[PDB]
Write a protein that binds this DNA or RNA. Structure first.
Ligand SMILES: [Zn+2]
Lengths: 697, 486, 135, 493, 117
DNA sequence: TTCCCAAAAGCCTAAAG
DNA sequence: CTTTAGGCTTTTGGGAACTGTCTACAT
RNA sequence: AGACAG
């Protein structure tokens, strides 16, 4: 009934073409899958999918990197913060600027190219840029380069042609209690393999308003913020700027007071602790005769500002030389023009022209502006969302040790545990196919590792593979087995491997990798369930469908009574990983007493958000007024709305032998009802109109 | 017994103020000093987009100290009160000019605007002030034209003093023929019962907090409705800020103009800053932005536990139980409160044994409960189980766990699934509030609200547990009964 | 019950799929509402509801106890039936293939995609109106 | 992976479109000609000025534009402006040009302006924020909507709708469609709507209109009102266009006729203008056709050269699209992927308003001072950029946690209604015949890729789409075969 | 439309006894709703002596007509009217100033700061 | 933007001095 | 015969999900 | 008011 025929191409569906078995999942699951592709950060440990389609090649080809746009000759190479040993030495160089000339043109346009250590586009996620060794070593003035040459490419792009989006996990479909509702059960090692890299920027302004404190230096050396390549304190705190007051000099300017941070009355920017600092950008208004910062606390600031000033001065000098050489023939790239203008905005103006009043989006700038950009590696242990490259999305609800995870008789250790029945409801069956097929393929490879005198779960050394390749008979037999398995799974791949020049290389690659990577195209003439039946009803190629033993929550080492199959699913991490939790015992208040939202500077100043959550909306207050008498609900809203009631609540917390189980929070006799600010405002506004709502007599 | 509206006699409010009474009539304006004083009384100013530091201050921004409480500032003759707890009282007052009998109640103006004021003709304006221009032949309607003709034939004087003094006869004529045409009985009874309260001598100009001006780069942001109010007050100023004193007719006209501006302001403000979906009544009067509240992704415990058991994590526990930890630190260790806050904030992103012990001892000292009582909310709030009480039992020692171990059983009461959803948590600060919330505890949604004698389907066991029970119970581990006997 | 767990893999799907009556119920079907959603689905329900055919299978053991609603398993093993567009109209030509086998054509994939789009819209805007009426 | 396996996978895989993968906005905005080094934006500006040059007072020649030196770029960004040399410190990826005009061979003050300077991957940085610039899927010459022919001009956004009307012929009642179009924006006895034949009769005489646009004569077969005047037409010289004119005439006459006393005044013009006297509006409507609209209509298959020819074509040839349309609103073939016309909407509006308010003042001698004042008040620094982040819906905020621009960055399309985004609307997208299933999605757009923006397939862009020069969506032949069949099934009854 | 040429609006019915079964069948066609809930909703819809502008719940429950949603919301208790749309309409209403017996609503205690009396 | 639904306008028809 | 009341049809205007995050903003 | 999360 044309069950094995697919009248489709990879062309008619782009992102859905990232996976095979797309037609075995419901459309909602597929749309969610594409959305999760869009929302996935980049993992440090990236691996190619076990099942390959032709889309991944194109997606790897079109990615973000540092490309020479045209055939150009490199004219100059510049580097911020010169690296070496000295007084004002810098540990690491963040950014390298390449000034190049697009020759083979009448104009010979001069352009700029930036090579940083990272590239970030999402608000809090990014990825390190790995530099091409064969190209980065050759980067020098007066060199030749081709068009579309790649530097500082993402780590997700492999050395061969493939893009790494997720991690292959030996998933097991057990209906364990850990996977209740929609969740995953994970181990420490697999989560170590999935650590997102987060790049963040902290901005602090210190001028006449406030001055930096001392948080990274001893009494002798004053350090407001970590250097380049330094590590944030165990309590992630930077800047901690304190308001400048002369009359409080012997109180808040002593060496102990500068090191000591008062959580209230001071302004700190609190990032992830232990996060290595990538780089620092310094902006200084140098044309103020009285320097607001008192002498002594401007060492690192002046250091980094001097390095940046030298960098931008060298850029400006290069532009001036080019202009003096080719006036009216200096057609330049727009990026180079903007870079020169930024350098001019950075460098001080001559004394014959009024100084620059620098702003940042209507926000005035005073003296010192510091932008510290730092990277961290998030360790997933809970509230981290994951997807299986299908519609299945879940949250890590249990993290166990490597030993505690399910292990087969072959020794395969499970990386994830998923509730199988969800597939029966969400109707995303392609996963299972992948799962199932992956297991077979994996076992096939392991079978060869047992028949070649090798060990499973251990990458063989080159000597062992050379010894195995010594005899042609077993190599050809293994290649024939691989051909048979491909014929069962992918007839297209079967033909491709039939037209193979060196089968010994293929067998060696399969043994080294430990898994035969399978090309399963979108237009693959396969009857999926027929292939499943063939794998099941075969002496070879059959996955080890045996008992599996794990450790339950009670600590016992228990073996599952029914046969369980372990198979590789290609997992992926998502955004909304958490870190947005907002616990706030007490929230800062507007002049009209009510909690408010958090502005950027005041929201990046607390470890974790300190937002006042609107947990009492109209629907919530409806449910409270109905389930409970309106009295207690009005009391809660009065404690929140009236600042005096909230102050009384906090006083009751602080002035009790047992802060928990306070008999009465607010003594209503001392603080009567009716003091809530919104209600008082409403009543006063009505009274200004001549009316007032009152109870019927 | 209900809740009805009652007309307020502005004279009684004026007499009960007994403080610093300053009137808006005596602002001649047109000069720097009086304009600045008027801007100080009106126009609550925010000079820059920056957080203020004066917790307690006077009307002027000169007494920034807070220990000076109740001290009358010599500059403003106004006592110093908390900025957040500042009493909401009318900022100014307006009295009748020297040639005006009295002032019309703004509620009466708004009530009469619905009927008297029409697109083709303004009946109240024609009846009250003299400088009103109209063309009878320009009335494009028929009912309005007939009403205008009847009013013209009746022939009332068009003075404010005449309207106030003979308000009974004018109002009866308005009732009689067609002018209002509806709600005649209620409106007539309202006028007859509250006649004395509809013409107050003094009229309050609302509080400084009502009117907000935020100066910043690119100007000074204001609101739209405030504008109307401003005009009204300015109008009364122009009554006394005249080089040539106005004739009584002109004074009546300006007074009516100001009163109409007040009525329009109150109508627009009630329609916009209260009635709209974001506002005062529907946004703050019925709950907004609680304190002692957290919000986090719900990751749970699949372990033998209690249904009324919750596990708040390290960061949420430290920030939410900030003052509990401060109290414990101060009580046990000789630590100042500043050192207590420093320790707590320093150890939010890091683990230590001391704060964990303090959490354990807090939860233990919550004696007749499993832990610290709290409420847990899932949005949108549809059912009884969307909001449910839980008891905090343990902060998690793992700093990387920003998770909330709500019970597995209580999952189905809301639509809570572990797919990456953040739920809200409110800490109950009292035993009375915990006892009150006991009515929102999960055991309240066991019995189905739509079936007489049936437990609600929200108590059904989850997927994995049911499948485990199936694979255990429904197995052929024994021969059939006949073979077992034989 | 730390060892009496439930497990899902390709073997269970093959065990349900390879049943001869299911295979018959997925072949020789007139593409009509009566010939699909009353005859073939009836045969598949008769296969599932038999208390003797499938024993020890996680999928059907869960199905017999309400863990899985019958509709999803029917749309998987049997033919998917007449998806809907954004407006609630039924396409004349049904879907020949379920979810266990692959829906590899273009027409069927597009119409099931439109069913998913209908799901999203009927979630969003109908919630918008329904919550106001509830309030 | 086996390198040979990857090689065979590459061989057995169709490549995407480098035009669309690297950024179609990049190609349509920041691509330089090889003969002369000039961006696409600069050429678009020159085209707009050359189109608007018809409205110059014989000597105000537009010389062109140059690329400003970064020295001048910084000097012009940071001006004195009341003793505060204000500078905005931000990346703000931009580049400055200067528009230069000439007057009788002497230069004026050049007017500098800023331009977005798109990067690879449709990426811009504006005021320190990273934005993604998506193309807008636009109809080439005109759209056909639920019951309407929607035609956009440089100024107006006109819509041609239709209704039914009755007229008596030979004593028997007959029904004909009257095509109307509201053009007086201030417009928003039975209430009727401005018919196109009403505009014909308002401009030309009724007999003049009939003689000029048809081989039909008029008296004052027999045509008469339903529920006085009599229009007699030769028994053999009849046409659908003449019948439509008759129907529109009776539609405009049957409800009004208190101003019709002597029927001969119907042959005049002032009477019809009174029935509709904004002669400025009439003249703007007459001279409300420009070169781009004419070129697009020629591309579609219409031969408009004057707006009255356009009205004749709509009344006679394009009216077929109003009742039974061969093309469908549901499809997406034969559509453009416009970028510049929406990015430079502010600049286009500024140039149009400058030209109109400059011609409308006087036709006398122009002084250099007045020309400089007009240029200063018209072409400011941020004329085309002040509204990029607020008024344009094609510029979105980038929140991609990936190294790949394909998945979220470069594969976003925006519909026109979502492209403006100043409306802040919600059509509910369900009771819309526009959002029906069509096979075009499979070739243009991505079904099963269903964001909440457009839950159907039109939200995103199919990355293998064949797009030729000037951003016209071409149709790949081979898959087209299969696609055709699918479409039939989508309309199975 | 039911709750709030011939249609089946609730206000068109004379007594709630003959009005309950229609709503019961209409709901039970697609949602399985208990009769008690339907009775409570209809009884909430009711009004006693609508001519005399009395909007409180009838007793024992039959001696009383029906009323539309907006009039009941804006003419029963101003505290409950504040949480619904168009607060200026009952604020600017003569009837709201008349000392008439009225029903109690929980929002009353929220309309004021919490003062019981 | 478009559908819901109530409240005021407006209109023909009818009854009392 | 003249002058208003009564009820039906038009027109107009307020209103249209909850919580959280982020984004935009001088010339 | 646009996107995202539920
Ligand atoms: Zn003072």
């Amino acid at each position: 009934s044309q069950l094995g025929r697919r009248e489709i191409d990879l062309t008619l569906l782009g992102h859905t073409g990232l996976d095979p078995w797309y037609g075995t999942t419901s459309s909602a699951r597929g749309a969610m899958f594409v959305t999760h592709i869009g929302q996935a950060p980049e993992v440090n440990g990236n691996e190619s999918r076990y099942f390959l389609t032709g889309a991944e090649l194109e997606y790897a080809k079109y990615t973000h990197d540092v490309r020479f746009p045209e055939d150009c000759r490199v004219l100059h190479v510049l580097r911020k913060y010169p690296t070496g040993i000295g007084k004002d030495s810098i540990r690491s160089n963040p950014v390298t600027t390449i000034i190049y000339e697009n020759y083979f043109d009448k104009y010979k346009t001069i352009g700029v190219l930036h090579v940083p250590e990272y590239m970030s586009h999402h608000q809090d996620f990014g990825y390190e840029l790995v530099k091409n060794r064969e190209v980065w070593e050759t980067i020098a003035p007066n060199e030749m380069f081709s068009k579309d040459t790649v530097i500082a490419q993402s780590g997700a792009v492999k050395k061969d042609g493939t893009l790494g989006m997720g991690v292959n996990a030996n998933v097991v479909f057990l209906s364990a209690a850990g996977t209740i509702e929609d969740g995953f059960v994970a181990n420490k090692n697999f989560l170590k393999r999935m650590m997102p890299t987060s790049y963040s920027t902290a901005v602090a302004n210190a001028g006449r308003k406030a001055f930096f404190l001392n948080m990274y230096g001893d009494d002798k050396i004053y350090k407001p913020f970590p250097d380049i390549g330094d590590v944030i304190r165990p309590d992630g705190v930077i800047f901690a700027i304190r308001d400048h007051d002369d009359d409080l000099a012997p109180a808040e300017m002593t060496p102990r007071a500068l090191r000591t941070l008062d959580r209230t009355f001071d302004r700190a920017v609190i990032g992830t602790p232990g996060a290595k600092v990538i780089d620092i950008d310094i902006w200084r208004d140098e044309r103020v005769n009285p320097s607001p910062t008192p002498t002594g606390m401007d060492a690192q600031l002046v250091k980094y500002h001097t390095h940046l000033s030298s960098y931008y001065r060298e850029l400006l000098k290069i532009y001036r030389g080019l202009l003096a050489r080719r006036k009216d023939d200096l057609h330049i790239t727009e990026e180079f023009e903007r870079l020169i203008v930024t350098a001019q905005m950075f460098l001080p103006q001559p004394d014959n022209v009024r100084k620059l009043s620098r702003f940042y989006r209507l926000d005035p700038l005073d003296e010192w502006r510091v932008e510290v950009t730092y990277k961290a590696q998030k360790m997933p242990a809970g509230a981290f969302k994951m997807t299986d490259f299908h519609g299945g999305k879940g949250v890590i609800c249990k993290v166990m040790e490597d030993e505690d995870m399910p292990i087969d008789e072959n020794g395969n250790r499970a990386d994830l545990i998923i509730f199988g029945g969800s597939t029966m409801r969400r109707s995303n069956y392609g996963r299972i196919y992948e799962h199932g097929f992956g297991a077979a393929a994996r076992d096939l490879a392991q079978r060869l590792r047992v028949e070649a005198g090798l060990d499973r779960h251990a990458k063989p050394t080159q000597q062992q593979l050379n010894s195995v390749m010594g005899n042609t008979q077993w190599v050809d037999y293994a290649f024939k087995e691989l051909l048979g398995f491909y014929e069962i799974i992918a007839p297209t791949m079967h033909s491709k491997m039939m037209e193979h020049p060196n089968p010994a290389e293929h067998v060696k690659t399969v043994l080294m990798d430990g898994f035969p990577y399978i090309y399963a195209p979108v237009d693959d003439p396969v009857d999926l369930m027929a292939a499943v039946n063939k794998l099941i009803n075969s002496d070879k190629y059959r996955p080890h469908y045996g008992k599996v033993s794990y450790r339950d929550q009670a600590g016992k080492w228990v073996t599952t009574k029914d046969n369980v199959l372990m198979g590789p699913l290609y997992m992926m991490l998502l955004e909304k990983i958490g870190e947005d939790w907002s616990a706030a015992a007490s929230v800062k208040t507007q002049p009209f007493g009510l909690p408010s939202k958090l502005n950027n500077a005041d929201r990046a100043s607390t470890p974790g958000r300190e937002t006042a959550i609107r947990s009492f909306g109209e629907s919530e207050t409806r449910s409270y007024n109905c389930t409970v008498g309106p009295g207690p609900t009005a009391e809660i809203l009065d404690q929140t709305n009236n600042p005096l009631a909230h102050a009384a609540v906090i006083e009751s917390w602080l002035t009790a032998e047992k802060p928990s189980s306070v008999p009465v929070a607010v003594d209503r006799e001392k603080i009567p009802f009716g003091g809530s600010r919104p209600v008082a405002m409403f009543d006063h506004l009505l009274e200004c109109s001549g009316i007032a709502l009152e109870y019927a007599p | 017994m209900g809740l009805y509206a009652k007309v307020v006699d502005h004279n009684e409010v004026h007499d009960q103020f007994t403080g610093k009474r300053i009137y808006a009539n005596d602002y001649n304006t047109s000069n720097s000093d009086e304009k600045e004083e008027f801007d100080r009384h009106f126009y609550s100013h925010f000079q820059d987009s920056e957080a203020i530091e004066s917790s307690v201050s006077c009307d002027c921004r000169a007494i920034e100290d807070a220990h000076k409480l109740g001290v009358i500032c010599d500059i403003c003759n106004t006592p110093v009160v908390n900025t957040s707890s500042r009493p909401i009282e009318p900022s100014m007052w307006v009295r009748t000019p020297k040639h005006v009998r009295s002032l019309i109640n703004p509620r009466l103006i708004i009530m009469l605007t619905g009927y008297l004021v029409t697109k083709e003709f303004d009946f109240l304006a024609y009846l009250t002030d003299t400088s009103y221009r109209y063309d009878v032949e320009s009335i494009g309607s028929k009912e309005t034209r007939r009403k205008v003709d009847r009013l013209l034939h009746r022939g009332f004087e068009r003075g404010l003093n005449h309207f106030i003094d003979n308000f009974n006869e004018i109002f009866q004529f308005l009732l009689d023929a067609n002018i209002i045409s509806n709600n005649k009985s209620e409106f007539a009874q309202f006028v007859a019962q509250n006649k004395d309260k509809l013409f107050p001598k003094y009229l309050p100009v609302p509080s400084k907090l009502c009117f907000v001006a935020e100066s910043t780069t690119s100007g000074t942001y204001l609101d739209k409705p405030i504008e109307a109010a401003i005009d009204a007050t300015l109008t009364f100023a122009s009554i006394d800020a005249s080089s040539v004193p106005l004739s009584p007719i002109k004074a009546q006209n300006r007074t009516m103009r100001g009163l109409r501006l007040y009525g329009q302001f109150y109508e627009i403000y009630a329609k916009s800053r209260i009635a709209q979906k974001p506002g005062l009544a529907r946004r703050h009067m019925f709950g907004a932005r609680l304190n002692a509240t957290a919000r986090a992704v719900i990751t749970s415990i699949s372990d033998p536990h209690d249904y009324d058991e919750l596990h708040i994590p390290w960061g949420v526990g430290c920030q939410l139980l900030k003052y509990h930890l401060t109290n414990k630190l101060k009580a046990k260790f000789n630590m100042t409160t500043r050192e207590a806050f420093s320790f707590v904030y320093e150890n939010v992103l890091q683990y230590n044994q001391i704060i964990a012990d303090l959490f354990k001892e807090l939860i233990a000292e919550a004696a007749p409960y499993k832990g610290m009582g709290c409420t847990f909310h899932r949005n949108p709030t549809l059912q009884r189980g969307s909001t449910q009480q839980f008891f905090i039992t343990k902060v998690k020692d793992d700093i990387n766990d920003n998770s909330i171990s709500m019970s597995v059983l209580c999952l189905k009461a809301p639509n809570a699934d572990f797919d990456g959803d953040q739920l809200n948590l409110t800490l109950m600060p009292d035993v009375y509030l915990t006892k009150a919330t006991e009515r929102i505890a999960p055991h309240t949604w066991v019995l189905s609200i739509d079936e007489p004698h049936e437990i609600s389907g929200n108590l059904e066991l989850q997927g994995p547990v049911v499948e485990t029970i199936i694979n255990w119970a429904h197995e052929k581990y024994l021969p059939p009964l006949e073979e077992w006997l034989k | 019950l730390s060892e009496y767990l439930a497990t899902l893999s390709m073997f269970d799907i093959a065990e349900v799929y390879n049943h001869p009556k299911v295979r018959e119920a997925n072949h020789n079907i007139e593409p009509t509402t009566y010939g699909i959603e009353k005859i073939s689905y009836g045969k598949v329900k008769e296969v599932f509801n038999d208390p003797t055919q499938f024993i020890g299978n996680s999928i059907i053991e869960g199905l017999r106890s309400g863990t899985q609603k019958t509709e999803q398993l029917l749309q998987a093993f049997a033919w998917r039936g007449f998806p809907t567009d954004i407006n609630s109209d039924i396409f004349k030509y049904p879907v020949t293939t379920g979810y266990i086998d692959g829906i590899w054509n273009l027409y069927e994939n597009m119409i099931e995609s439109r069913s998913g789009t209908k799901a999203l819209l009927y979630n969003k805007e109908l919630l918008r109106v329904t919550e106001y009426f509830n309030r | 992976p086996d390198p040979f396996l990857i090689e065979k996978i590459r061989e057995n895989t169709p490549c995407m479109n480098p035009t669309l993968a690297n950024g179609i906005t990049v190609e349509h905005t920041m691509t330089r000609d090889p003969n002369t080094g000039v961006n696409m934006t600069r050429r678009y500006i020159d085209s707009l000025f050359d189109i608007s040059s018809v409205l110059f007072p014989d000597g105000f020649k537009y010389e062109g534009n140059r690329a400003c030196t970064p020295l001048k770029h910084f000097e012009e960004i940071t001006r004195e402006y009341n003793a505060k040399r204000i500078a905005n410190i931000a990346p703000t990826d931009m580049y400055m040009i200067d528009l230069m005009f000439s007057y009788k061979g002497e230069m004026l003050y050049p007017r500098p302006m800023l331009l977005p300077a798109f990067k690879r991957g449709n990426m811009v940085t504006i005021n320190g924020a990273k934005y993604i610039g998506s193309p807008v899927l636009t109809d080439v010459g005109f759209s056909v909507l639920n019951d309407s022919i929607f035609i956009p001009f440089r100024r107006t956004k006109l819509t041609f709708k239709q209704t039914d009307h009755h007229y008596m012929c030979n004593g028997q009642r007959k029904i004909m469609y009257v095509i109307w179009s509201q053009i007086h924006n201030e417009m928003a006895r039975p209430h009727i709507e401005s018919c196109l034949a009403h505009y014909f009769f308002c401009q030309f005489g009724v007999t003049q209109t009939f003689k000029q646009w048809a081989n039909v004569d008029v008296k004052c077969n027999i045509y008469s009102s339903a529920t006085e005047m009599v229009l007699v037409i030769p028994r053999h010289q009849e046409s659908i266009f003449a019948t439509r004119l008759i129907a529109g005439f009776w539609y405009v006459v049957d409800a009004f006729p208190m101003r019709f006393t002597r029927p001969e005044y119907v042959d005049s013009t002032n009477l019809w203008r009174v029935i509709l006297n904004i002669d400025s509006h009439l003249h703007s409507f007459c001279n409300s056709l420009d070169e781009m609209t004419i070129e697009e209509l020629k591309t579609v298959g219409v031969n408009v050269s004057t707006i009255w020819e356009l009205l004749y074509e709509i009344m006679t040839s394009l009216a077929h699209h109003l009742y039974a349309t061969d093309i469908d609103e549901t499809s997406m073939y034969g559509k453009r992927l416009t970028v510049l016309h929406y990015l430079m909407s502010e600049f286009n509006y500024a140039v149009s308003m400058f030209g109109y308010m400059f011609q409308s003042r006087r036709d006398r001698e122009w002084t250099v001072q007045e020309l400089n004042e007009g240029l200063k008040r018209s072409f400011k620094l941020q004329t085309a950029i002040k509204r990029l982040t607020v008024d344009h819906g094609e510029l979105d905020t980038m929140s991609n946690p990936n190294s790949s621009m394909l998945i979220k960055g470069t594969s976003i399309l925006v519909t026109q209604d979502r492209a403006k985004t100043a409306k802040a609307h919600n059509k509910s997208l369900i009771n819309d015949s526009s959002r029906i299933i069509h096979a075009s999605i499979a070739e243009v757009g991505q079904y099963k890729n269903q964001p909440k923006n457009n839950p159907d397939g039109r939200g995103r862009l199919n990355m293998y789409t064949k797009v030729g020069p000037t951003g016209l969506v071409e149709r790949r032949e081979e898959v087209r075969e299969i696609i055709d069949n699918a479409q039939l099934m989508f309309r199975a009854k | 439309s039911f709750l709030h040429t011939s249609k089946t609006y609730l206000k068109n019915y004379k007594s709630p006894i003959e009005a309950l079964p229609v709503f019961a069948t209409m709901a039970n066609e697609k949602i399985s709703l208990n009769i008690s809930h339907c009775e409570i909703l209809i009884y909430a819809m009711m009004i006693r002596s609508a001519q005399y502008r009395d909007y409180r719940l009838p007793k024992p429950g039959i001696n009383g007509q029906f009323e539309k949603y907006n009039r009941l919301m804006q003419c029963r208790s101003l505290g409950g009217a504040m949480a619904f749309e168009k607060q200026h309409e009952p604020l600017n209403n003569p009837g709201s100033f008349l000392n008439k017996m009225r029903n109690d609503h929980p929002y009353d205690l929220l309309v004021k700061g919490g003062k019981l009396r």
